[PDB]
Write a protein that binds this DNA or RNA. Structure first.
Lengths: 50, 75, 53, 74
DNA sequence: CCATGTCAAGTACTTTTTTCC
DNA sequence: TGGAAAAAAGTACTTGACATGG
């Protein structure tokens, strides 16, 4: 039940993309957003699953 | 070629194949295409299937064995 | 995506991508009926699979 | 000579080959080069490829089989 | 602690090779 | 020649020991 963007980010952060876990910094650069936003999204997606 | 300089791992070969190659001073697809089909079958643990596989995957990308190259390598 | 059904599963398990909770090797193994060791071995393999695609 | 006295392991042979040799009271390259190509093929589990390998790796270092040596061994 | 993760080998089954008739 | 059948390489999984940070 996660949006395209939400899922992406966790695969990013968790390395589920290229085996490498990515700092907020890098993922932010990818979607063109601030590290803050990423985290906020990550966490939101995490809450969505529990 | 641009694909000639790439590492052999870009071939996603099987373990057997891979191991034989790393055991054979073969790192770059360029080093590889220069080796004749026969010169390979000599290499230990490399049999028909491995050989066969390799030909197929080189073919799947335009390449074949025993190719004659010049100006080799680039470092 | 070149990862088997199992391989993928495990990383979502382990990374919590399932229920937001990251699972120890113990639990996932218990789930698949295997030893923690095996799980790790599979994880790392699937990890290596994505560094070299 | 200096490379004749070395252990056969310096040849970095395959396991198969290796095992055959240790199964054959062959420890030193000197012992080896004295064995005829034919005398080898008889040895169990040693076949074309194994034989072949060995010839090539002996050649890669100046050596061939069936060599007639003197003052051998100790 | 002490639970989880990591390492080094170790057993046991499948696939490929390699001998050899 | 070609094919059964030994031996080796590989692949799945276990085990017990260790470290280590949580």
């Amino acid at each position: 039940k996660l949006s395209e963007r939400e899922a992406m980010v966790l695969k990013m952060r968790k390395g589920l993309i290229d085996g490498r876990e990515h700092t907020l910094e890098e993922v932010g650069a990818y979607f063109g957003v601030t590290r803050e936003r990423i985290r906020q999204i990550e966490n939101k997606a995490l809450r969505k699953l529990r | 070629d641009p694909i000639l300089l790439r590492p052999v791992d870009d071939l996603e070969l099987t373990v057997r194949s891979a191991n034989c190659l790393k055991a054979e001073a073969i790192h770059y697809i360029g080093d590889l295409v220069q080796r004749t089909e026969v010169e390979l079958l000599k290499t230990p643990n490399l049999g028909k299937k491995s050989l066969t596989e390799i030909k197929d995957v080189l073919a799947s990308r335009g390449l074949s064995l025993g190719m004659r190259l010049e100006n080799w390598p680039p470092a």
